[PDB]
């Protein structure tokens, strides 16, 4: 029973007003059952595509979530994950500077 790690990054260089794709990449969890939400200002984002689940050489599962997004000065974007290993949902926020 392993805890998920979350990395949130953009596909292209962010620039305010320009269409982009935001990735949320959830690794290292087990068992494979899991709920991934991508959030805009705390509202769940509707049209979110997920990859097929897979696992690495070390057996832990990983999964790629992604949505279209146009970043602005004022919008925050997050990735929230429910999993059996965690008492509590984990949220990591996109930080264009990190």
């Amino acid at each position: 029973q392993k805890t998920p790690q979350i990395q949130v990054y953009s596909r292209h260089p962010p620039e305010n007003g320009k269409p982009n794709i935001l990735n949320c990449y959830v690794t290292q969890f087990h068992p494979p059952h899991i709920e991934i939400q991508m959030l805009k200002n705390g509202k769940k984002i509707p049209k979110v595509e997920m990859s097929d689940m897979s696992f690495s050489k070390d057996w832990s599962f990983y999964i790629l979530a992604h949505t279209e997004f146009t970043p602005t000065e004022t919008d925050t974007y997050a990735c929230r994950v429910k999993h059996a290993s965690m008492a509590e949902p984990k949220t990591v926020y996109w930080d264009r500077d990190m």
């Binding site: 494979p32 689940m53 897979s54």
Partner: protein, 269 residues
């Protein structure tokens, strides 16, 4: 050079709920998916059938169809002699070396831990696997048609199939996509310090060099993150550098990739 992997993911939640989904990878490119909801294996590439005819492909798809069913109830049958939830994973395929050489593998994990392998001509429990596996595995070994089938697949079918995959998917496997790169920074926890970030996105194949430079001198403080997948079958990586306030001037990020043509990308902070 190329690892081909068929990855099985089987969850048994109870006496009558179970699912088995798979994905097949040739290197870092997905070739197939097979959903528990689905009768037939799905192609995720125009070339996913490789050099095989329709007759050969159906035959091979048939043997996996009987396998998905039999695996399910052999496992269920096993549990009802013994504790749910059960998660079983299986990783099967071959590593393709240059000079037409190769090595096959068939590894099985239980509860996220490697426990059983197929090796040579029999199934084996891996050292320190639970002892209760010994009897089921000796019993499965007594089934010669299954064991002859697995040897056949591992020894012949896998490398044979992969060779046609590599031919048929040459323009995807040998594709070049350029990295586009950008810089940002962020405070760090120690006062008067910063972390410069060099992000490199959209590149293919995987091998890349990303380093923070001061002129010709590599900044050995460069800290490479992990390769992160994009969704368009390209890669993402970032390299951070912790620096002192003021000391930022003249730092560059330089990236080398096979598709850039020997002209590195150099960004200046």
């Amino acid at each position: 050079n190329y690892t081909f992997r068929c990855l099985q993911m089987s969850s048994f939640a109870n006496r009558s709920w179970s699912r088995t989904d798979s994905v097949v990878w040739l290197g870092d490119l997905q070739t197939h998916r097979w959903s528990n909801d689905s009768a037939t294996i799905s192609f995720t590439k125009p070339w996913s059938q490789g050099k095989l005819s329709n007759q050969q492909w159906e035959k091979l798809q048939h043997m996996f169809q009987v396998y998905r069913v039999s695996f399910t109830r052999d496992i269920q049958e096993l549990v009802k002699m013994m504790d749910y939830p059960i998660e079983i994973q299986l990783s099967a395929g071959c590593e393709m070396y240059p000079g037409n050489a190769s090595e096959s593998f068939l590894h099985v994990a239980f509860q996220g831990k490697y426990v059983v392998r197929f090796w040579g001509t029999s199934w084996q429990t891996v050292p320190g696997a639970p002892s209760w596996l010994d009897l089921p595995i000796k019993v499965l070994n007594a089934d010669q048609g299954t064991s002859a089938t697995v040897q056949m697949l591992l020894n012949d079918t896998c490398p044979l199939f992969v060779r046609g995959l590599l031919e048929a998917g040459k323009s995807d496997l040998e594709k070049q996509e350029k990295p586009v790169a950008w810089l940002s920074s962020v405070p760090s926890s120690a006062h008067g310090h910063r972390q410069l970030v060099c992000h490199v996105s959209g590149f293919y194949p995987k091998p890349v060099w990303v380093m923070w430079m001061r002129g010709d001198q590599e900044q050995q403080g460069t800290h490479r993150g992990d390769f992160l997948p994009n969704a368009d079958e390209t890669w993402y990586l970032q390299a951070t550098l912790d620096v002192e306030a003021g000391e930022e001037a003249g730092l560059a990020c330089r990236v080398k990739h096979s598709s850039l043509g020997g002209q590195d990308i150099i960004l200046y902070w």
